[PDB]
Amino acid sequence: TIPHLAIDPFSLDFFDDPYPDQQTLRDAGPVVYLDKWNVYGVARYAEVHAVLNDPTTFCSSRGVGLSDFKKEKPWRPPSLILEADPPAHTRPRAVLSKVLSPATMKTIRDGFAAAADAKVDELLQRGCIDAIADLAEAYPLSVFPDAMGLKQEGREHLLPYAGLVFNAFGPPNELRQTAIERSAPHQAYVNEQCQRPNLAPGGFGACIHAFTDTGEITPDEAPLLVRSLLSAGLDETVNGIGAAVYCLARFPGELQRLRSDPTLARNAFEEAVRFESPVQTFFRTTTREVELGGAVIGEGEKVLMFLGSANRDPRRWSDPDLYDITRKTSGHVGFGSGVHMCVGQLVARLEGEVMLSALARKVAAIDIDGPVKRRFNNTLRGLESLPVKLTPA
Ligand code: HEM
Ligand SMILES: O=C(O)c1ccc(Cc2ccccc2)cc1
Numbered sequence: 001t002i003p004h005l006a007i008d009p010f011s012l013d014f015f016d017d018p019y020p021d022q023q024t025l026r027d028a029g030p031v032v033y034l035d036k037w038n039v040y041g042v043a044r045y046a047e048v049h050a051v052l053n054d055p056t057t058f059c060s061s062r063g064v065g066l067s068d069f070k071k072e073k074p075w076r077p078p079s080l081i082l083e084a085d086p087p088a089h090t091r092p093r094a095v096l097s098k099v100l101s102p103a104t105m106k107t108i109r110d111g112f113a114a115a116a117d118a119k120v121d122e123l124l125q126r127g128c129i130d131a132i133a134d135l136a137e138a139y140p141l142s143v144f145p146d147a148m149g150l151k152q153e154g155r156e157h158l159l160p161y162a163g164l165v166f167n168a169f170g171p172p173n174e175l176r177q178t179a180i181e182r183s184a185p186h187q188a189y190v191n192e193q194c195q196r197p198n199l200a201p202g203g204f205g206a207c208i209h210a211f212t213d214t215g216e217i218t219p220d221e222a223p224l225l226v227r228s229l230l231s232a233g234l235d236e237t238v239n240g241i242g243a244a245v246y247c248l249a250r251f252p253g254e255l256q257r258l259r260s261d262p263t264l265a266r267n268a269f270e271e272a273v274r275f276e277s278p279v280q281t282f283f284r285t286t287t288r289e290v291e292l293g294g295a296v297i298g299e300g301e302k303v304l305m306f307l308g309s310a311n312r313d314p315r316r317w318s319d320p321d322l323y324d325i326t327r328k329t330s331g332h333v334g335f336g337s338g339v340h341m342c343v344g345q346l347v348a349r350l351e352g353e354v355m356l357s358a359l360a361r362k363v364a365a366i367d368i369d370g371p372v373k374r375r376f377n378n379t380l381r382g383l384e385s386l387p388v389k390l391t392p393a
């Protein structure tokens with residue numbers, strides 16, 4: 001009843017161009033079986049959304065990667081929020097929801113916006129830049145580690161550790177094995193910065209430790225919660241920003257619309273998150289026999305969700321392959337959906353908005369003027385290099 005496909009969604013061929021195989025996965029049926037890794041797959045919006053919003057049946061505590069924590073040892077101590085189910089997930093989630101809250105965004109928005117304007121002004125003096133290294137990577141690195149309260153030394157570990165985390169969600173392929181092989185120095189840095197004395201007052205990390213006297217988390221839980229904010233947030237925001245720049249370069253009519261109304265900056269970034277989906281895939285594990293899409297999935301089975309495919313499903317989106325900064329993007333699963341829906345989404349939207357705002361006000365044209373190179377990751381989609389010429393407005 002369930003079609004079996006040999007598509008490897010973690011192969012370099014798939015990463016280079018996933019969209020034809022994603023239609024093949026969508027059109028084969030609501031539920032497929034991937035023989036390469038012995039997992040179930042769902043690539044349509046309806047089933048991805050249904051799985052995300054049933055955390056009791058499709059749990060996260062057995063891992064959101066390929067590895068089943070009931071069968072294998074996690075490569076690092078499990079996250080207290082990402083790899084936890086209700087009710088254990090609830091109170092750590094509440095703390096992070098209060099640390100990265102709407103009220104907290106008010107305290108950081110002016111400095112985030114000023115740094116975005118300053119970076120665009122700096123890049124416009126150079127003219128020809130790499131929109132990945134010099135913009136998509138440089139800007140988050142210029143605001144987020146300071147907002148965390150991290151010291152200056154050792155920040156070069158942040159990008160490798162982020163890429164390692166997302167590669168480790170993948171299958172035991174070469175990308176995952178080499179990442180873990182080189183991981184020891186990055187883990188040692190990250191774990192040490194999670195201790196309370198190493199987090200500057202007023203920052204995100206110090207605020208997490210401050211919640212330890214409320215009864216929501218204990219002091220021994222705070223280091224691992226800080227680790228969450230040093231694992232997530234960087235690479236996805238970098239890829240989302242680089243994707244927005246790539247789209248404004250490939251779709252010049254949308255840059256012109258954004259220039260004419262810079263208040264479209266926030267939705268322009270949200271559409272880039274849907275269009276690119278920096279987090280392409282992750283897993284759930286069934287806790288019981290479940291009926292999904294006419295399929296009887298047994299207990300203890302890994303289910304692979306294709307977030308980027310769900311965000312391009314023509315059953316849900318009109319013209320899904322078009323970048324439209326005025327599209328009604330509400331309902332996209334680029335940040336997930338349900339109880340685990342990205343708790344840092346306000347930080348990501350703030351960074352993306354103020355960067356696209358600076359571009360909208362200061363830049364007249366964005367033209368690719370060099371070879372575009374893709375960055376390969378088991379979980380993340382994004383570019384490695386995006387040579388562009390920025391024309392001042
Ligand atoms: C464009 C930027 C981002 C994207 C596309 C993204 C994507 C996602 C997705 C899809 C999930 C759901 C995970 C799941 O359901 O298993 C998630 C969760 C999470 N994200 Fe993000 N994220 C982004 C930015 C950030 C930022 C800026 C932060 C922190 C400052 C962050 C921290 C987290 C955390 C801690 C979780 C776990 C939440 C939970 O399990 O309840 N993310 N993210
Ligand atoms: O260490 C953590 O708690 C943590 C790490 C990464 C992420 C981002 C993500 C991971 C897998 C699937 C979708 C998104 C969230 C939380």
Ligand SMILES: [Cl-]
Nearest residue numbers: 076187190191
């Ligand atoms: Cl670690």
